[PDB]
Amino acid sequence: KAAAPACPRFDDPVHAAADPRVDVERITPDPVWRTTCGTLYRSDSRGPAVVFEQGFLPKDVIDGQYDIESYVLVNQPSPYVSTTYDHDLYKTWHKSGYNYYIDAPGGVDVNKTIGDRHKWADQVEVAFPGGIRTEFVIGVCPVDKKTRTEKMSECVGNPHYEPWH
């Protein structure tokens, strides 16, 4: 094989945002940004026809919960779209229909920002302020709820995905 190259470093930490109205200075605590560029994942019940068209939009960039600890622990409407480093986290999700694959720069590394002591540290989450544009959504695999497995013959690539590294 070969050894992997480092990742491109973007100047804007929310370059990936689907809603650029997000206010980075409102993020608390001081965010530790993800600097790796491996695939990330999101369990979502929303279908690819919607996600491939819109990307992942956050619930409320205006008056949503900008405190990452509060958002992780109680999940009010927020400027964030959560993803995970863990390909298999979909297996822990009740009924969410799809495992989305994401290739996006940046995001707030939740455990590096609020520590790995908290209740949901096992989710190894990356929270995207402003969400995630469709160009950074690779594709999706539907999940068979009864076996908690991906239906790999039914995965779909996002025609809008734009490789960048």
Author numbering: 36 to 200
What does the paper say about this structure?
S. scabies produces a 200-residue, 22-kDa protein that is a single-domain enzyme called Scabin. Scabin has been cloned, expressed, and purified, and shown to harbor dual enzymatic activities (GH and ADP-ribosyltransferase). Scabin targets DNA as a substrate for ADP-ribose modification; it also shows enzyme specificity towards genomic DNA from Solanum tuberosum tubers.
According to our Scabin-NAD+-DNA model, Tyr129 is important for binding DNA, based on its location and orientation in the complex. Previously, Tyr129 was shown to be important for DNA binding, but was not involved in the reaction mechanism. However, binding of DNA substrate is likely controlled by a rather large contact area and contributions from several backbone and side-chains within the Scabin active site. The rest of the Scabin variants showed either a WT-like crystal structure or similar CD spectra to the WT in solution.
